[PDB]
Amino acid sequence: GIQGLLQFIKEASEPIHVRKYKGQVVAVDTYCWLHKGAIACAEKLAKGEPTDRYVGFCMKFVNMLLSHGIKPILVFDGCTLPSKKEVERSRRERRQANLLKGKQLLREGKVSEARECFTRSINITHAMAHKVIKAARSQGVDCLVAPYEADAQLAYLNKAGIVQAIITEDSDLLAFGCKKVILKMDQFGNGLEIDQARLGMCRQLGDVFTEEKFRYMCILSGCDYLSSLRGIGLAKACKVLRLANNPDIVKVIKKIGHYLKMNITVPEDYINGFIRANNTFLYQLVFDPIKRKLIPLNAYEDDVDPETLSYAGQYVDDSIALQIALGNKDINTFEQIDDYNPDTALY
DNA sequence: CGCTAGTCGACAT
DNA sequence: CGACTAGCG
Ligand SMILES: [Mn+2]
Ligand SMILES: [Mn+2]
Ligand SMILES: [Mn+2]
Ligand SMILES: [Mn+2]
Ligand code: NA
């Protein structure tokens, strides 16, 4: 996420209802509904007991969107991203820790805290996601497993005109360059839409409302790919970019002390890390549903050389990418767990 | 005022 | 994979 981004650009938001997008296509960051639905049956999942509450939970939202005349395209997280593997190790070990801690707190008699500790152990498997996938295919709803992060895939689907809005709880989508993002949507359709064009309404941003500058700001504040410098948040980063009349961000990051009046030392790790983060936001591998090909989020600029972008996602053969995207190929074992075919029945 | 970092809701009975 | 809020620059 970009910590505190929503309240920072709150002036560009607008309370709406999804009825607004009737007769149009909307992509969904399904992990949110998956997580929320998985909260309801934390004990069943932790113990390993069979359950399918989260499926119906997601299907409520899906059927709702279908009822209001929307065509939803559920998008799911795929393979792990190397840039994001630190946090994905942290969350893992913490999940295990709270799992065992809850298992022990079950024996104290404090069942009230064992379940709260089971809440911090929710691990959304790809099998659950695939249950949701078949459940969605039942009502003739298209699904798409991102080659890596769902964020990038959604961003592409939005910037390519395939969808007109994105349903998520994550503010990362704005940093990826989404035109329209619908946050905090309930089971009835009440949501909070953030439009990119309205970023100019935010006084705090100043002239930092262009996609590139906005990206730089979000990265400088601290993201999932690169932790920020101690004492650097959204406001100070935005201040840096505002006071900086320089197309070359590197020298600016170097003169961050001159811009912020703070004696800040910039390590050599942070420059490379910044270029890493920017290249991750720009050229993370997504999946084209039309041409059925593995492509970066944005077209490669002459500035960067793709050979040094393994962290932004590794390429594979397009057929395998297709079988992953359909959910037919297991993300982990790479073995065929299903055989759905859109040919013999978005693409 | 701005930022870090820890707490605790989210679902829902 | 988030919204607050105290505690500190
Ligand atoms: Mn995030
Ligand atoms: Mn995501
Ligand atoms: Mn994200
Ligand atoms: Mn400027
Ligand atoms: Na920060």
Side-chain angles (χ1 to χ4, degrees):
Chain A
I2 292 314
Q3 297 175 300
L5 183 60
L6 172 58
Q7 286 298 330
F8 185 81
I9 57 172
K10 61 176 182 178
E11 305 168 359
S13 59
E14 177 186 4
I16 67 160
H17 192 270
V18 283
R19 173 180 52 254
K20 178 181 182 179
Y21 291 103
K22 184 186 178 184
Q24 302 174 226
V25 186
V26 173
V28 178
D29 190 15
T30 326
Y31 167 76
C32 304
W33 300 347
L34 259 173
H35 196 251
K36 287 187 174 183
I39 297 177
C41 51
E43 302 81 6
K44 288 291 181 63
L45 291 175
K47 291 187 175 184
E49 303 178 353
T51 181
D52 64 278
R53 184 79 63 175
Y54 56 90
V55 171
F57 189 91
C58 299
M59 282 306 301
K60 277 183 275 292
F61 287 78
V62 173
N63 291 329
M64 188 239 85
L65 283 176
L66 291 177
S67 76
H68 283 265
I70 328 290
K71 181 184 178 182
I73 302 184
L74 309 184
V75 180
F76 304 83
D77 281 279
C79 302
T80 315
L81 197 67
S83 297
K84 233 227 255 179
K85 200 158 301 179
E86 297 182 354
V87 194
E88 203 141 335
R89 285 175 185 176
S90 171
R91 296 172 185 174
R92 208 177 80 259
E93 288 292 338
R94 292 179 66 182
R95 275 194 305 267
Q96 185 182 13
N98 269 252
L99 170 62
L100 293 186
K101 190 181 235 62
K103 286 184 177 179
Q104 263 194 346
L105 284 180
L106 190 271
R107 308 171 189 178
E108 281 197 7
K110 307 193 313 177
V111 199
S112 180
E113 271 297 279
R115 298 170 179 175
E116 187 88 8
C117 207
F118 281 161
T119 316
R120 320 189 197 281
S121 63
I122 305 303
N123 187 18
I124 309 298
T125 87
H126 296 280
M128 302 165 51
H130 191 264
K131 283 185 177 179
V132 181
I133 286 176
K134 281 186 174 179
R137 291 201 200 281
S138 299
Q139 261 66 21
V141 181
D142 289 331
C143 292
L144 180 67
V145 173
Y148 296 96
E149 284 189 274
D151 308 23
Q153 186 64 56
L154 297 162
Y156 172 76
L157 291 185
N158 187 266
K159 294 166 67 174
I162 303 184
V163 302
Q164 281 65 36
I166 308 295
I167 297 177
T168 183
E169 303 288 339
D170 195 348
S171 58
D172 282 315
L173 278 302
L174 291 174
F176 272 94
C178 286
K179 300 297 181 300
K180 295 175 177 183
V181 173
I182 308 178
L183 302 169
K184 298 178 176 179
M185 188 189 64
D186 47 22
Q187 55 189 0
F188 309 120
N190 306 290
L192 184 62
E193 172 181 282
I194 294 182
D195 199 328
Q196 187 191 228
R198 304 200 223 103
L199 282 181
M201 295 178 59
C202 302
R203 261 298 270 173
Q204 293 71 20
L205 290 177
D207 58 88
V208 192
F209 57 92
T210 65
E211 183 175 345
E212 184 166 288
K213 285 179 177 294
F214 194 79
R215 190 188 321 122
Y216 293 164
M217 183 195 65
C218 287
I219 298 179
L220 271 179
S221 68
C223 52
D224 294 332
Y225 314 135
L226 178 68
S227 303
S228 64
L229 306 179
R230 259 267 189 169
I232 299 300
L234 277 166
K236 291 185 182 178
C238 182
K239 180 170 179 294
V240 167
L241 293 173
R242 275 190 284 125
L243 297 180
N245 186 19
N246 240 269
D248 192 80
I249 185 60
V250 196
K251 307 177 181 181
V252 182
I253 301 175
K254 293 182 178 180
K255 286 189 176 182
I256 191 182
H258 174 56
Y259 286 109
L260 279 180
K261 288 265 192 170
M262 298 175 55
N263 199 90
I264 301 176
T265 309
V266 182
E268 195 57 37
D269 323 328
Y270 192 77
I271 301 296
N272 307 329
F274 182 88
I275 302 184
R276 229 116 57 195
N278 185 83
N279 288 337
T280 302
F281 272 114
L282 279 184
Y283 314 108
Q284 180 177 158
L285 302 191
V286 302
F287 182 71
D288 198 330
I290 312 176
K291 295 185 177 183
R292 292 178 173 177
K293 193 186 180 61
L294 249 180
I295 52 177
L297 172 61
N298 300 278
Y300 287 122
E301 284 295 302
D302 312 328
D303 200 324
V304 78
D305 181 87
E307 270 181 317
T308 64
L309 302 180
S310 68
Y311 49 82
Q314 179 220 24
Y315 283 95
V316 289
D317 200 87
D318 290 325
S319 64
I320 304 155
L322 173 62
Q323 292 304 319
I324 287 185
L326 294 172
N328 288 333
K329 179 150 297 182
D330 198 326
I331 304 296
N332 309 115
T333 66
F334 247 81
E335 299 193 282
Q336 213 71 20
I337 53 101
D338 203 34
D339 46 34
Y340 176 81
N341 203 342
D343 287 338
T344 326
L346 176 58
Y347 301 86

